Amino acid sequence: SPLPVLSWANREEVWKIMLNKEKTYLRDQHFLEQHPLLQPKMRAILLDWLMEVCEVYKLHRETFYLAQDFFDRYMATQENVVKTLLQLIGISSLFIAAKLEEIYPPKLHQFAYVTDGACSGDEILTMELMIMKALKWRLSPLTIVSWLNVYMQVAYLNDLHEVLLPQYPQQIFIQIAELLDLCVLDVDCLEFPYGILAASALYHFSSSELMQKVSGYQWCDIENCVKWMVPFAMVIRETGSSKLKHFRGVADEDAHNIQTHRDSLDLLDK
């Protein structure tokens, strides 16, 4: 019940399905225990590099977050992965996500190319099939950033109650996304539901009353997450936020949806 009365369906129904899909899409904060040769900063390095390829290719934030999610969930089904297999598993999660999400995704030879020789097309092909079968073809999660999308729409809701037409400030959205991009780099984020992560980040840029009104969470749903997020918010606050970018070939009304990259790895140490 942050959603308004809907013009296309039952808001109670829509929100409930949204809540309940969040409960079939299982995430595990300790999944790297299954991979003793891996450390959390490998996961962050891998995810950080994907953000940078997304920006180079002007892929959407939704596609980065799909890839992040396919990656984390895939690894939980798997048992002894080595550092050198990471780039394959990551660029292949990205390949699936871009085919799902983009009108004109980069071609497979483009995903081979950006690995600088380390993965071949045939290997990305083998691996996407391994990933999809292991996920049992559940490739439609509500990602961290889609919740932020939802929340921002409600924030900026008119007395003309259409939620489906984008109607929020581009530049503030970017600034909360940049905090979430830092927080995904740390694997312990996985302990909090994606909708909580996105609520807690928005809270840090606003208040409990806004947070509550746009994501129907009471403050105690959010409190634990907010506490964990604290350091990340502070590091961001310390540095100041980024400016909204223009991207060649991308419509300005779509610019805030393009995935960006900054030195989040530096920021993750503090």
Partner: protein, 298 residues
Amino acid sequence: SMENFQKVEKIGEGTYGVVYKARNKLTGEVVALKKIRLDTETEGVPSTAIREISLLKELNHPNIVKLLDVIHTENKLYLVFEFLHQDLKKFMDASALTGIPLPLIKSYLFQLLQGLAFCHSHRVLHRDLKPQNLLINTEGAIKLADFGLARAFGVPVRTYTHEVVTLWYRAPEILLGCKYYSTAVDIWSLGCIFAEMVTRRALFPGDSEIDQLFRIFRTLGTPDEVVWPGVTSMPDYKPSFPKWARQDFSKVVPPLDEDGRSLLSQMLHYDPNKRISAKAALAHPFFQDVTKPVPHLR
């Protein structure tokens, strides 16, 4: 895997593979198989198949063709679906001299709207509703099929693929190049289909984008800022379009009563923000001798 099915008949072909009717050897069960030859594919698992699979894995409903299994068996990917009899196109054509009885037309529309209400509540746009993607069985059921062009939608939406929906069933917000489209596009297609069941003639059988728009305009009247706030600012609006008056629905759909006419008229509203939802359509009086509201909790 594949041993225990046998192909009985090729029943379809598209860009990404071939469709078969298949039969289980001593189960007697019949299925439809879509076969993708991965060795033939240049981007693997086509984006359309990844979407069709993932979307249908989470869309289980009596009025949505069921995805039963996905089988990877080297160089090939098989999607296994419940098999249905035929196709609303073929049923309409077979019934064209007789007419489909009104009660059956009403049943089919009600079921289509239930299956669509369900997609929309789960945030899925079908985007290719046309009679050949509506499958019927021998027991009076009808179901939404071929989710090869569907997509999950976000809240809010962003700009999606522009080349969507078969021409005859394509909504005016798509034809006029709107930045955004939504669930309203599927309701448009069903409103065209409803009238087509009634008349046994496609409502707006265009042979080009501009002919399609002119067919719509001639029947429903040329839209302006009053009926449709923003039309005149749409990328493919032209001030030169002729100004046709709306045709009275008594003449467009003669067999239909007042309820049918009212429903159809709400399904073909120009303004996507005013066009009726699949859910609200279910509560329409047209469906009184079919359904009842559930108790309203505040």
